[PDB]
Amino acid sequence: MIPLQHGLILAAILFVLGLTGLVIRRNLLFMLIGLEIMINASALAFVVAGSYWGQTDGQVMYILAISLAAAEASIGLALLLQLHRRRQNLNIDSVSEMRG
Amino acid sequence: TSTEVIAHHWAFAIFLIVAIGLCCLMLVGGWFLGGRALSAKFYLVAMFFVIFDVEALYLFAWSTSIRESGWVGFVEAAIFIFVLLAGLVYLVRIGALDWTP
Amino acid sequence: MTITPQNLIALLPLLIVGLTVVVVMLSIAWRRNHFLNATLSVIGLNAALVSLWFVGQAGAMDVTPLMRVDGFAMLYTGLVLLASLATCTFAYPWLEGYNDNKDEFYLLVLIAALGGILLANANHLASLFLGIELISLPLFGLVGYAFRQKRSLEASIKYTILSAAASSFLLFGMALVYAQSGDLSFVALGKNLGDGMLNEPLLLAGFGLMIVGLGFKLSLVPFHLWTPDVYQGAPAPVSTFLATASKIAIFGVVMRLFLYAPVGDSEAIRVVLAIIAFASIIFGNLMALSQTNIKRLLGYSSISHLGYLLVALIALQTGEMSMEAVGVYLAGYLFSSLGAFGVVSLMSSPYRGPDADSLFSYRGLFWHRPILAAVMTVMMLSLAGIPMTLGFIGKFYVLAVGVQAHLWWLVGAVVVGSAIGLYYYLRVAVSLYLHAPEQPSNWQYSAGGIVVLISALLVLVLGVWPQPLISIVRLAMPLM
Amino acid sequence: MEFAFYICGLIAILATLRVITHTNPVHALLYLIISLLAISGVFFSLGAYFAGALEIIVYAGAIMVLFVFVVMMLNLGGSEIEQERQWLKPQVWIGPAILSAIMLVVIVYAILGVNDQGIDGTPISAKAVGITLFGPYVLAVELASMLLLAGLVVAFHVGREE
Amino acid sequence: WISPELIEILLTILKAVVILLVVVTCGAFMSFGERRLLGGSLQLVADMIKMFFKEDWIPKFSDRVIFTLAPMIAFTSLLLAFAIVPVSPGWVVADLNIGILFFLMMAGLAVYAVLFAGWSSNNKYSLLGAMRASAQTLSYEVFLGLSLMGVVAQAGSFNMTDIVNSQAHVWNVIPQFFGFITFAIAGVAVCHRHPFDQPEAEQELADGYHIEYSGMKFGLFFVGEYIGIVTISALMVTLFFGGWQGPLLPPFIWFALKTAFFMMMFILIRASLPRPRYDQVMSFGWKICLPLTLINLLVTAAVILWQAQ
Ligand SMILES: CCCCCCCCCCCCCCCCCC(=O)OC[C@H](COP(=O)(O)OCCN)OC(=O)CCCCCCCCCCCCCCCCC
Ligand SMILES: CCCCCCCCCCCCCCCCCC(=O)OC[C@H](COP(=O)(O)OCCN)OC(=O)CCCCCCCCCCCCCCCCC
Ligand SMILES: CCCCCCCCCCCCCCCCCC(=O)OC[C@H](COP(=O)(O)OCCN)OC(=O)CCCCCCCCCCCCCCCCC
Ligand SMILES: CCCCCCCCCCCCCCCCCC(=O)OC[C@H](COP(=O)(O)OCCN)OC(=O)CCCCCCCCCCCCCCCCC
Ligand SMILES: CCCCCCCCCCCCCCCCCC(=O)OC[C@H](COP(=O)(O)OCCN)OC(=O)CCCCCCCCCCCCCCCCC
Ligand SMILES: CCCCCCCCCCCCCCCCCCCC
Ligand SMILES: CCCCCCCCCCCCCCCCCCCC
Ligand SMILES: CCCCCCCCCCCCCCCCCCCC
Ligand SMILES: CCCCCCCCCCCCCCCCCCCC
Known part of the structure; x- marks a missing residue:
């Protein structure tokens, strides 16, 4: 008796908030945090869609989504550690030598 | 909608509520009462934990339905476990899991 | 459904590449050897090409609810495998200049090729998402392989953050499409609509967010700004792979998705893609x-x-003939980009360290590298759509396809962008032969030179005589 | 099971809203963990029991642990961005906020008007998810293993110290 | 206001409250028993009064929320993980479909106690000791679930009552022996107990993260650890020793006897077995216990599918 629209709207709200955090935050760690919020919102949307249709495919999509989230979080935090070790600064604006 | 199911739901809710309230009330009583007067190997280990935990969740899903999946599911999980073990052997042999080199 | 032995023999390039990943990893664990691990990777990729021959001897059939193998899948699998083999060949001398571990390169190249094969066979939103991610993450490693160099680390960070955002967009759009349509297969995206109700708002919005993700991956405007940075900052064989194999595999799965989905013939999606195509041609040129x-x-x-x-x-x-045009153009673009990025890779090899500059300095290349200059100017002519080159055959196919479909704005965009391309491509091709003031010896460098020379000969011969390529692409027909 | 969904969704929204507007990394990660707990509550309210279990086990229990590990290892003590606090200046956040609000209204307009008989909430067990996973999604499982392998190799090659 | 449905609801609520109170008091009595073996109830009352009436001093340069939050995690994580354990027929708090998955969720949340205590305790040595302790418990949580998965594979479900009913003929310690030893090792390591007591003791660059915790916060850490032993022993009983199933005694008597036996076995394991080095512990975990759990799950699945005609 929960509408599918409400779950989808909640997932869209979380996706929008994660994207806002990814854009407005200058620290690379907070950009990674917003990326996790975005992909978790996408996985929540898939779970809501699967639970509406009564199918197991939504949870399998969630499982693949969180496998990607885990692997890309590990890669992003390795790159963050490399940036901190090379520059002692987590500024994403300072890493901008390549330009048009 | 069984009365046993709703009774167990109420019991679980009361268990969690009373437990968290007991911890919070004990800290509140402790606070109110009484008068007054790094290495990168940690990242490597945590990252290996995250990767192997996701592959563990795959095996978690497999384990509860082994009989329904049959021998073909066993073959697929055997390929999965062999790839996981090859990655583990690789990490061990390259010194990634060696804490004291 | 289950996996039959017929499903196993159809799965052969994927199985051989996965087994190659495992074997190369175990060989790395046994001892860190550059030559033998590179040899094992290229042996696995050549065995995957011969496996594609064996797949062609079998039929076209749906190996899973997820995968479908047909001549389309075989063609794009072969393109991905050729790009991966060329990347390994270009990578060996550059990695010979490298100081750190130089075999995880081959492991990541093999995993990215596995993702390319999955995208070639992808009949499902599951396999599409997984193939995109299997392309992307080893490319996160490969783009920042020389992370001590500032430009490579910057390109790695940019590509990683932007591809994570694009995968979030694609996943959310997939979720919205699955919310509208209860099945995740390509053929079922819009089946539960009728009487002109194909333009369901949720299906359109989900396809738009998927368009955002896929247009990041294909460097389409306005998701294109990462492309010059990641291309310049990455290692040159990584630039070769990212230019060829990633774009080829993702554009192939976009072909199959828009061919199979009943919402693929929506007018709104057609107009949005036409706007993106116009802007992409004009803006890139x-x-x-x-x-x-x-x-x-x-x-x-x-x-x-x-x-x-x-x-x-x-x-x-x-x-x-849209699929035929895409196949011919993709073969020509593959060979042109392989030659051009291979010349750039061979002149940047061996690696000079993270501190030393990696500038190409193509001016006056003919006076010390004449064969490389000839190969590079053949590529520059081919990418300009000059007749006697295969790039012109692809451009002719695109123009014929647009003229048949009465896409006049797109045809005029192709003409204008082609003129602008003529300017900058000829600038490079004639700067190859000017005079510059100032500013190998192993068979792997000679193998890379052989690869770019064979690419040049293929471009010239198939520009003069394009009938074998057209015949090959015509018999690589997907399921109708 | 509707009350649980609505309160957990509201808690999740408020928690990520406090995540993206916070300055201390450990506090932001704590609010992120709270948001993940709430989203697992949303999963349990819908009947996706395996999804909620994995949300606490893996997302709030492994990946956030990696984030906390990285934060305590880099020792963020206000490196010229906490003292600057540029994201709460209106000229910095007003643009992306209107852009994200426009995207939210467009997506929500797409969400509404779709036919909807309601989510039943009938539990989809880990049994059925495991049956689907090793049945029609076998290649997804094997290539996801290869995906996690690629992430492992990349993160080792980049993130090691030497 | 009399109805048998409501009588059933309050009776189950009373059962859950009794189970909770017995678990906390039994963890406190475990604290007394370990302190004595290496009245007594009056001594614990005196100690609890002292923790109440000692001033609670948060450091000035410490983050108050994280500092206060770490002992609540160290208590409540495993004390809520007890809620799936069936101690008797009709005497379970929650008959969850996820069950042992809920135990895994609580352990995954439990790592934040050591992480948060070390971060909030403003000290570099305490921070490094917390990093070492967290690396250890992640290194053993990586195979805790699979050592459980052998038993889950045999029972065919995640429900604890179904696992116990599947142990009706043969207890799981006989087929799932390697799962049993790996689960014992990982449950000792998750609770930061001997021989995984002080990973900070291998270096003078590291100090304990219980340092700078005084009063009821230190009491919360202590009682939470002992409650963790109680629930790890009870889960070991319900997963590998038939739970409440026994030939002649009442079922709760058998469950209590097995739980008390494993509690005292953990006591003598602390008293007898020595402390290995840190690198030895992490190497043992990652290189022995995880492959053992994977091979155990494969062999268990092959045996199950073979004995299905
Ligand atoms: C020469 C000009 C340039 C060409 C450039 C080509 C680039 C891509 C290379 C790979 C392309 C593979 C395309 C395969 C399409 C096959 C479509 C098809 O349906 O073929 C069917 C045919 C068998 O016929 P049939 O009887 O219909 O079989 C089904 C009956 N059950 O089955 C077949 O015909 C099997 C086809 C096997 C293909 C094996 C390819 C091996 C590798 C060749 C590399 C060539 C060198 C290119 C690069 C040089 C270096 C840069
Ligand atoms: C910058 C340079 C490039 C410029 C852009 C590219 C060219 C743009 C040409 C615009 C053409 C507009 C046509 C408008 C009507 C389209 C719909 C229609 O009814 O078309 C008629 C017909 C299709 O209808 P059908 O029933 O099949 O009739 C067949 C017999 N005519 O249609 C046909 O059968 C085919 C119609 C062909 C139209 C002309 C194509 C060749 C154009 C030559 C070059 C452009 C014009 C000259 C240069 C201008 C300045 C650069
Ligand atoms: C009468 C109307 C009806 C008939 C229309 C027929 C159209 C097709 C045939 C005519 C094409 C005319 C092209 C005119 C420009 C030719 C290119 C040129 O002048 O190149 C030289 C110049 C480089 O020299 P310089 O100025 O020193 O360089 C500065 C930068 N370093 O280069 C540059 O400065 C940059 C060059 C940029 C790329 C070339 C220009 C492309 C412009 C669009 C091409 C298509 C035009 C379509 C019709 C337009 C309206 C007539
Ligand atoms: C009260 C105002 C706010 C106070 C502060 C916040 C406190 C926490 C509030 C959110 C969590 C509790 C919400 C209320 C749940 C009550 C139980 C309930 O509704 O159960 C229904 C359903 C039972 O399952 P089912 O069988 O489907 O039921 C139908 C009958 N057969 O249940 C289900 O299907 C699943 C039930 C939800 C999942 C378990 C609980 C998740 C808890 C997440 C906590 C997140 C972090 C909270 C932090 C708080 C502080 C900021
Ligand atoms: C400072 C406070 C911070 C927040 C603390 C926690 C906030 C919430 C506290 C109030 C909870 C109210 C009660 C929640 C509902 C309980 C009943 C329930 O969840 O039932 C639903 C489901 C039943 O499943 P089953 O019985 O198998 O099937 C029946 C078929 N319909 O059963 C399930 O789905 C069970 C799975 C969900 C269980 C969630 C348990 C709580 C999780 C939070 C732990 C916090 C640990 C410490 C802090 C960590 C770091 C912040
Ligand atoms: C029901 C009884 C079946 C008995 C025979 C079982 C063995 C034959 C079928 C094996 C199928 C294996 C499929 C493995 C797919 C692996 C894909 C890996 C991609 C990297
Ligand atoms: C058939 C291929 C046509 C396109 C490729 C063009 C390259 C052909 C081979 C190299 C030609 C080099 C000519 C250099 C002339 C330099 C003269 C300098 C002194 C005036
Ligand atoms: C900045 C670069 C701009 C390039 C613009 C190229 C435009 C080429 C000319 C397009 C002409 C389109 C004519 C369409 C006519 C349609 C008639 C339909 C009748 C039913
Ligand atoms: C270490 C043991 C922890 C046990 C926690 C739960 C205690 C519950 C007590 C229940 C007692 C009655 C059980 C049902 C009746 C059967 C046994 C009767 C004789 C005791």
Whole structure:
């Protein structure tokens, strides 16, 4: 008796908030945090869609989504550690030598 | 909608509520009462934990339905476990899991 | 459904590449050897090509609810495998200049090729998402392989953050499409609609967010700004792989998705893709005008060429030879980019360390590298759509496809962008033969030179005589 | 099971809203963990029991642990961005906020008007998810293993110290 | 206001409250028993009064929320993980479909106690000791679930009552022996108990994260650790020793006897077995216990599918 629209709207709200955090935050760690919020919102949307249709495919999509989230979080935090070790600064604006 | 199911739901809710309230009330009583007067190997280990935990969740899903999946599911999980073990052997042999080199 | 032995023999390139990943990893664990692990990777990729021959001897059938193997899958699998083999060949001398571990390169190349094969066979939103991610993450490693170098680390960070955002967009759009349509297969995206109700708002919005993710991956405007940075900053064999195999595999799965989905013939999606194609052609050609960097120039070039391919995709539901045009153009673009990025890779090899500069300095290349200069000017002519080159055959196919479908704005965009391309491509090709003031010896460097020379000969011969390539692409027919 | 969904969704929204507007990394990660707990509550309210279990086990229990590990290892003590606090200046956040609000209204307009008989909430067990996973999604499982392998190799090659 | 449905609801609520109170008091009595073996109830009352009436001093340069939050995690994580354990027929708090998955969720949340205590305790040595302790418990949580998965594979479900009913004929310690030893090792390591007591003791660069915790916060850490032993022993009983199933005694008597036996076995394991080095512990975990759990799950699945005609 929960509408599918409400779950989808909640997932869209979380996706929008994660994207806002990814854009407005200058620290690379907070950009990674917003990326996790975005992909978790996408996985929540898939779970809501699967639970509406009564199918197991939504949870399998969630499982693949969180496998990607885990692997890309590990890669992003390795790159963050490399940036901190090379520059002692987590500024994403300072890493901008390549330009048009 | 069984009365046993709703009774167990109420019991679980009361268990969690009373437990968290007991911890919070004990800290509140402790606070109110009484008068007054790094290495990168940690990242490597945590990252290996995250990767192997996701592959563990795959095996978690497999384990509860082994009989329904049959021998073909066993073959697929055997390929999965062999790839996981090859990655583990690789990490061990390259010194990634060696804490004291 | 289950996996039969017939499903196993159809799965052969994927199985051989996965077994190659495992074998190469175990060989790395046994001892860190550059030559033998490179040999094992290239042996696995050649065995995957012969496996594609064995797959062709079998039939075309749906190996899973997820995968479908047909001549389309075989063709794009072969393109991905050729790009991966060329990347390994270019990578060996560059990695011979490297100081750190130089075999995880081959492991990541093999895993990215596995993702390319999955995208070639992808019949499902599951396999599409997984193939995109399997392309992307080893490319996160490969783009920042020389992370001690500042530009490589910066390109790695940019590509990683932007591809994570694009995968979030694609996943959310997939979720919205699955919310509207209860099945995740390609053929079922819009089946539960009728009487002109194909333009369901949720299906359109989900396909739009998927368009955002896929257009990041294909360097389509306005998701293109990462392309020159990641192309310039990455290692040169990584630039070769990212230019060829990633774009080829993702554009192939976009072909199959828009061919199979009943919402693929929606007018709104067609107009949006037409806008993106027009903007991509014009913007990429205009932005490559004033570039002194060869890698940024090839990045904007890839933007424009993927715009031409998208024009060929727009006419998929109206004409008939859209898949044929895309196949011919993709073979020509593969060989042109392999030659051009291979010349850039061979002149940047061996690696000079993270501190030393990696500038190409193509001016006056003929006086010390004449064969490489000839190969590079053949590529520059081919990417310009000059007749006697295979790039012109692809451009002719795109123009015929657009003329059949009455896409006049797109045809005029191709003409204008081609003129701008003529300017900057001829600037590079004639700067090869000027005079510069100032500023190998192993068989792997000679193998890379052989690869770029064979690419040049293929471009010239199939530009003069394109009938074998057209015959090959015509018999690589997907399921109707 | 509707009350649980609505309160957990509201808690999740408020928690990520406090995540993206916070300055201390450990506090932001704590609010992120709270948001993940709430989203697992949303999963349990819908009947996706395996999804909620994995949300606490893996997302709030492994990946956030990696984030906390990285934060305590880099020792963020206000490196010129905490003292600057540029994201709460209106000229910095007003643009992306209107852009994200426009995207939210467009997506929500797409969400509404779709036919909807309601989510039943009938539990989809880990049994059925495991049956689907090793049945029609076998290649997804094997290539996801290869995906996690690629992430492992990349993160080792980049993130090691030497 | 009399109805048998409501009588059933309050009776189950009373059962859950009794189970909770017995678990906390039994963890406190475990604290007394370990302190004595290496009245007594009056001594614990005196100690609890002292923790109440000692001033609670948060450091000035410490983050108050994280500092206060770490002892609540160290208590409540495993004390809520007890809620799936069936101690008797009709005497379970929650008959969850996820069950042992809920135990895994609580352990995954439990790592934040050591992480948060070390971060909030403003000290570099305490921070490094917390990093070492967290690396250890992640290194053993990586195979805790699979050592459980052998038993889950045999029972065919995640429900604890179904696992116990599947142990009706043969207890799981006989087929799932390697799962049993790996689960014992990982449950000792998750609770930061001997021989995984002080990973900070291998270096003078590291100090304990219980340092700078005084009063009821230190009491919370202590009682939470002992409650963790109680629930790890009870889960070991319900997963590998038939739970409440026994030939002649009442079922709760058998469950209590097995739980008390494993509690005292952990006591003598602390008293007898020595402390290995840190690198030895992490190497043992990652290189022995995880492959053992994977091979155990494969062999268990092959045996199950073979004995299905
Ligand atoms: C020469 C000009 C340039 C060409 C460039 C080509 C680039 C891509 C290379 C790979 C392309 C593979 C395309 C395969 C399409 C096959 C479509 C098809 O349906 O073929 C069917 C045919 C068998 O016929 P049939 O009887 O219909 O079989 C089904 C009956 N059950 O089955 C077949 O015909 C089997 C086809 C096997 C293909 C094996 C390829 C091995 C590798 C060749 C590399 C060539 C060198 C290119 C690069 C050089 C270096 C840069
Ligand atoms: C910058 C340079 C490039 C410029 C852009 C590219 C060219 C743009 C040409 C615009 C053409 C507009 C056509 C408008 C009507 C389209 C719909 C229609 O009804 O078309 C008629 C017909 C299709 O209808 P059908 O029933 O099949 O009739 C067949 C017999 N005519 O249609 C046909 O059968 C085919 C119609 C062909 C139209 C002309 C194509 C060749 C154009 C030559 C070059 C452009 C014009 C000259 C240069 C201008 C300045 C650069
Ligand atoms: C009468 C109307 C009806 C008939 C229309 C027929 C159209 C097709 C045939 C005519 C084409 C005319 C092209 C005119 C420009 C030719 C290119 C040129 O002048 O190149 C030289 C110039 C480089 O020299 P310089 O100025 O020193 O360089 C500065 C930068 N370093 O280069 C540059 O400065 C940059 C060059 C940029 C790329 C070339 C320009 C492309 C412009 C669009 C091409 C298509 C035009 C379509 C019709 C337009 C309206 C007539
Ligand atoms: C009260 C105002 C706010 C106070 C502060 C916040 C406190 C926490 C509030 C959110 C969590 C509790 C919400 C209320 C749940 C009550 C139980 C309930 O509704 O159960 C229904 C359903 C039972 O399952 P089912 O069988 O489907 O039921 C139908 C009958 N057969 O249940 C289900 O299907 C699943 C039930 C939800 C999942 C378990 C609980 C998740 C808890 C997440 C906590 C997140 C972090 C909270 C932090 C708080 C502080 C900021
Ligand atoms: C400072 C406070 C911070 C927050 C603390 C926690 C906030 C919430 C506290 C109030 C909870 C109210 C009660 C929640 C509902 C309980 C009943 C329930 O969840 O039932 C639903 C489901 C039943 O499943 P089953 O019985 O198998 O099937 C029946 C078929 N319909 O059963 C399930 O789905 C069970 C799975 C969900 C269980 C969630 C348990 C709580 C999780 C939070 C732990 C916090 C640990 C410490 C802090 C960590 C770091 C912040
Ligand atoms: C029901 C009884 C079946 C008995 C025979 C079982 C063995 C034959 C079928 C094996 C199928 C294996 C499929 C493995 C797919 C692996 C894909 C890996 C991709 C990297
Ligand atoms: C058939 C291929 C056509 C396109 C490729 C063009 C390259 C051909 C081979 C190299 C030609 C080099 C000519 C250099 C002339 C330099 C003269 C300098 C002194 C005036
Ligand atoms: C900045 C670069 C701009 C390039 C613009 C190229 C435009 C080429 C000319 C397009 C002409 C389109 C004519 C369409 C006519 C349609 C008639 C339909 C009748 C039913
Ligand atoms: C270490 C043991 C922890 C046990 C926690 C739960 C205690 C519950 C007590 C229940 C007692 C009655 C059980 C049902 C009746 C059967 C046994 C009767 C004789 C005791």
